[PDB]
Symmetry: C3
Amino acid sequence: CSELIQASSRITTCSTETKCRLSGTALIRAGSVGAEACLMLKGVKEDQTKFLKIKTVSSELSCREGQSYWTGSFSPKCLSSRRCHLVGECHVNRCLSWRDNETSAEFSFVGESTTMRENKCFEQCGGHGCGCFNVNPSCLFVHTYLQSVRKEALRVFNCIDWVHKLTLEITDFDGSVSTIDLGASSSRFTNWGSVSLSLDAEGISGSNSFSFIESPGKGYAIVDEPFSEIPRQGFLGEIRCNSESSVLSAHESCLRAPNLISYKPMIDQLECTTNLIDPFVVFERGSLPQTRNDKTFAASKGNRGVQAFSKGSVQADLTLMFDNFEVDFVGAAVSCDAAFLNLTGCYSCNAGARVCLSITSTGTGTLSAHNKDGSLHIVLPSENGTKDQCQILHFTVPEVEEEFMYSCDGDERPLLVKGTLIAIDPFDDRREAGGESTVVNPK
Amino acid sequence: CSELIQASSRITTCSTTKCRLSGTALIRAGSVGAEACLMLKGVKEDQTKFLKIKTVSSELSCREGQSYWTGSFSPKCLSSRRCHLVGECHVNRCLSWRDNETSAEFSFVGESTTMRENKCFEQCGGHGCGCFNVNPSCLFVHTYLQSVRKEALRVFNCIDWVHKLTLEITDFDGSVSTIDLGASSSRFTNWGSVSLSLDAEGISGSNSFSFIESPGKGYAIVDEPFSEIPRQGFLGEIRCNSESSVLSAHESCLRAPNLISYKPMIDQLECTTNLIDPFVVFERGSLPQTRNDKTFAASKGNRGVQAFSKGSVQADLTLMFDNFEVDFVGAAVSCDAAFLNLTGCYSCNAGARVCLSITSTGTGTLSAHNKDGSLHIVLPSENGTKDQCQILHFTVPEVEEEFMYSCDGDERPLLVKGTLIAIDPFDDRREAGGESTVVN
Amino acid sequence: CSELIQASSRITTCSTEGVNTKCRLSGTALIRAGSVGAEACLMLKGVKEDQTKFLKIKTVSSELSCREGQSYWTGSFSPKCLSSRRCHLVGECHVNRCLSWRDNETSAEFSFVGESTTMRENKCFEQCGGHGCGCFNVNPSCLFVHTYLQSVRKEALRVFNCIDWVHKLTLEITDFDGSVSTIDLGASSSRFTNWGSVSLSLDAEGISGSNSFSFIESPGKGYAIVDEPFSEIPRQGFLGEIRCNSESSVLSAHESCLRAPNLISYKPMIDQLECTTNLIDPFVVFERGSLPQTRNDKTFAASKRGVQAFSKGSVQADLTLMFDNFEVDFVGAAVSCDAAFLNLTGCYSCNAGARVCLSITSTGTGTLSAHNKDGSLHIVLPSENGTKDQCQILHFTVPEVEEEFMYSCDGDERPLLVKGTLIAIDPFDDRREAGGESTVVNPK
Ligand SMILES: *[C@@H]1O[C@H](CO[C@H]2O[C@@H](C)[C@@H](O)[C@@H](O)[C@@H]2O)[C@@H](O)[C@H](O)[C@H]1NC(C)=O
Ligand SMILES: *[C@@H]1O[C@H](CO[C@H]2O[C@@H](C)[C@@H](O)[C@@H](O)[C@@H]2O)[C@@H](O)[C@H](O)[C@H]1NC(C)=O
Ligand SMILES: CCC(=O)OC[C@@H](COP(=O)(O)OCC[N+](C)(C)C)OC(=O)CC
Ligand SMILES: CCC(=O)OC[C@@H](COP(=O)(O)OCC[N+](C)(C)C)OC(=O)CC
Ligand SMILES: *[C@@H]1O[C@H](CO)[C@@H](O)[C@H](O)[C@H]1NC(C)=O
Ligand SMILES: *[C@@H]1O[C@H](CO)[C@@H](O)[C@H](O)[C@H]1NC(C)=O
Ligand SMILES: *[C@@H]1O[C@H](CO)[C@@H](O)[C@H](O)[C@H]1NC(C)=O
Ligand SMILES: *[C@@H]1O[C@H](CO)[C@@H](O)[C@H](O)[C@H]1NC(C)=O
Ligand SMILES: *[C@@H]1O[C@H](CO)[C@@H](O)[C@H](O)[C@H]1NC(C)=O
Ligand SMILES: *[C@@H]1O[C@H](CO)[C@@H](O)[C@H](O)[C@H]1NC(C)=O
């Protein structure tokens, strides 16, 4: 039992059209995941007692997605062919006037594709030193196309709506147990009265913008940066498509930021390169579950989308109404014993460090702990028995040694969170790909 | 009537010693249109007094921060190629050319206060390129920018979101007044006081955003963080401090580096830009736009933007009644709800609009949820039949989703079904510019 | 006294485990935090005995502590280079050698430079040939370039984001003694006192708004806010386009530092060469956002370390009070205050905003609340017995501000005119050009 009640009152409710019903009313807080109000009720005018438990099972924010695109890993492949001045297409203005969608006759053997591709021409040296009788600039013709490095894609998306669901477990007067789902300003009729989410203060808060990646059949990941609305070089989605299949085939309908392919002309040699963000590196770094500002992001039931779970404290008021019954008393909290187990993770990182505790109690409650200056907060569930419970904290030193005071009933006792965390070196998701061209013999 | 009451108590208050006994009711705002019906009993006397409190709207006002003007810019250039050892084309000059130096090739060009730059690109020499001298020739270029359209756009961020909760209060005699309350504010009435005692209204979510004003044509949202300095490939890569400066493409405007591209072709030359079209950005996000159940729209008078909570509202009101306490409260009445239509897109920021036919016998709130609770609908119910709409976000083209609804708490099914359109991946970059005017 | 009472009743609490049956009867009071300086004055009466005692509860501060995530060091860097042009067929200037040059290949032209652990790169640019460029052969000459970076100033800056914002509500509680104690509450927390317990039963405090931001630490010189999202990797045109894992690595421009592609521009001029950078000046960024800074009524300041967000006006939290064997008898009434507009200093259309100051005359401790006509501007400031000045940040969009406020501490509002002149802040570019002409090496 948890101490959850904030207020208790009697209310008369009349049906205007004219019957009147008298109800006892209790304003309780959800408190935290696992918290449970134990209520014994007394009849208002009659001498009867009833029993009722209301338990906070979970607090979830469902991500309703907005804009979405597919991306992946890409790499360039080059065809090259240099002609002397006055040979082939290498006359006067042609090379310098070349268009990205004009294919040189040097590459006629190439059939038409539906692939992301471009064409270039670079003036090179002339004269004997470059195998030409003519001294004017020779023409290095280049045809390039993109290919998927691996035959799998990633779907990147933003979250526009975070829809709250507060799941409650209610043990009614008859002892029957039901699950009640409540949204914002929602009220549910029960056989003993009603229960309503009368004030909801749950929501995504903080100073960071973020988005998510779906890896088909391999889960989700968080991107700790704002969603990129258009293709931009140096950003995730600098190459993007409208389908999973178009990423795999590097289809021409994909969008890409300007100038993503580099060229290094070397007379008869030529390197075509890219320096793209590796989205799979991004995915592995932010692989769910991830916790940010006490919100745990993970895949929903059936891997349909992402959700933010509260695993500890919950900020929601619940108004209970009991027909013809009012509060006699509430169940008292019981103490719990907590022992530090381990601390694992990194410091100065978004993911943070995982602290695990062993919790022993004789009833369902909530462990609440804090460091001295109150900069750190631990909130974990307790029950009749002994379970390990973990959560994420964020530190900024390698050698952590911080004392906490904890309790489930208000009688605080010391607990030392001690461990070694690792550093994460500054990183760069860009990876060079590509290389020398395939040299075509002159025709 | 709505069941909004959370707590009821009898509180005595003492000044300094005069003491006043007031009935005290803690009610939830609930949602827009929700109305608390309170019959009071004389604490001292033997009178019954009726009182109604209705939530009319809940607005967050955007107090703006940094702001700039921008537009749709385009390049126009002059070019002139000279042979080596001719004119300025000597030794080091072309490779050493500075952006702010106008070539003597364009000595006929007057003074300017427009954004401009200058380049010199070496080109082929020798007989094949019309020069006796075999050394590299010099293609000089003078480029300035201009505004395509004769209109500009002001981009800005929002630093403060200031809450206003507007209440409609019905006195004992049936007199109706309107009260506005901000955070932690109270207001005296002729029957006591109403105060916003706990406010959980605010802008929450996983996205940062900004806004654009189009003078006399309304506002738009920008579903991306405000760009603090000029950056290539972002809105405001070119920006000015005024509207008039955008139209003249004045030299005081800022530019990110290297926004103008050059393609020298011996005697031909193209100067091009590939800039974000802010007008396209504007049209995509033109208000009203709804994000995380916040409806963003122009404030009345068309003076800045506001966020309206058109459905659910999270705020506690504390009511005090002088010498009166709560006798009873009006019961909620049930309503009938039927699906009307569903219009919009899927996997898009704007979302889709759902409309319901709602019939009831009194003022109240309709609440709905799909099976897994990932979708939520909150809409006002009234006596009679009225249409009500709200924005939802989906990720499939064919929607078929059963909702359970109630106004009184007794749930009934309802089917939201319709077809949503796709929005293809887009790029706001638009190519502009072209060939130069060739001198001589 | 403040009017903070929201509910009041008796609650009986009992052990239900079957061991020790101890039922305690408590009075219970649900109060709003209201704002900084808000103080509930509670006269309690005995529940089992004929006794009275006075109790006060005052909201002292509401702090959100930044638990940092990813972090990096940066600074202002500058390019320095050596250049040496060789004619075609001379030295390394053969076939396609110049066009094939790799960033990490030092030219033989610069064999004299010692071992280096500094950020550096090498280039080769083809230049003119023939007798006009001092060469016998007409194929392109080779301008070889070796470039290294250096830090201008001997300072560095640490840029970081905030992942967690841990709330702490501090209260001053005056017992029946007159004795005052300070208590700290986190979310859904309870603290026992000698008269019962106080618990933060509903917490509506948090970082809200439409902007993402991060922070900069200047070692021994405070912090700053950056009104833009943290950049996770080096990107040209952004803070952190060059970043390091330590302060000293910034100062030495160490090779372990990361940088975005092509941050060094080159201007080949036959035997002259300019190597330049146009990097974001992080010290300019720091100065613009120097703490304290107020955003959406949140005052960001140093912890005194790390950064915190203070709610100095309104505070949105409910507190649940339990009194052992005591219940609420009555509460102290709020008092009127009179406000006088002092001054208004700052800028318009800017993230920093403008600071308004009032002089608030009252007869007791409370809270002043005000609003302009359309309710787009809100003012919440602490009130005290006497005449005292108080200030807060507002945000405007005009150089000449004219706003009429209706203020109150009890509920009956009176007019108040706010009038001032705010400066404009022109659009800015944090980029600064650096570097210049190469040191020209003589051939060997
Ligand atoms: C609490 O559970 C008691 C039995 O649970 C036992 O389970 C074991 C796994 C181990 O944890 C033992 O220490 C436990 O005692 C049961 O006998 C009690 O009745 C329960 N207590 C309450 C208050 O329900
Ligand atoms: C409540 O509604 C009653 C019925 O509404 C009428 O108006 C029509 C528009 C349509 O809804 C029909 O059902 C009805 O003829 C009306 O008679 C009552 O006066 C209304 N009462 C109040 C208090 O609004
Ligand atoms: C028949 C004479 C001859 O063979 O000399 C060369 C040709 C032009 O050569 P090309 O462009 O056909 O192929 C060059 C091979 N490569 C790429 C290895 C350099 O004639 C000229 O010198 C220019 C007219
Ligand atoms: C008298 C020397 C002469 O006139 O011919 C020049 C030399 C090559 O010159 P270099 O590369 O050794 O140095 C010149 C210094 N510079 C480029 C900075 C001006 O010979 C050739 O052209 C090919 C053998
Ligand atoms: C290339 O694009 C241009 C338009 O920019 C078009 O006119 C031309 O036909 C295209 N060429 C080919 C081969 O598709
Ligand atoms: C830490 O403790 C938890 C809880 O039992 C356990 O699951 C986990 O494996 C432990 N990790 C390490 C590294 O010991
Ligand atoms: C252009 O900029 C240079 C900077 O070196 C300056 O000396 C010069 O006065 C400016 N104006 C002109 C017309 O060159
Ligand atoms: C959907 O129904 C609403 C309410 O009647 C109406 O205003 C709107 O025009 C309808 N939409 C379409 C596309 O018919
Ligand atoms: C330069 O870097 C390449 C990889 O890009 C490496 O293979 C090569 O060994 C490096 N050369 C030197 C001299 O460090
Ligand atoms: C404005 O008044 C405050 C209150 O005393 C004072 O601290 C500040 O210096 C004043 N500033 C100006 C510019 O008058």
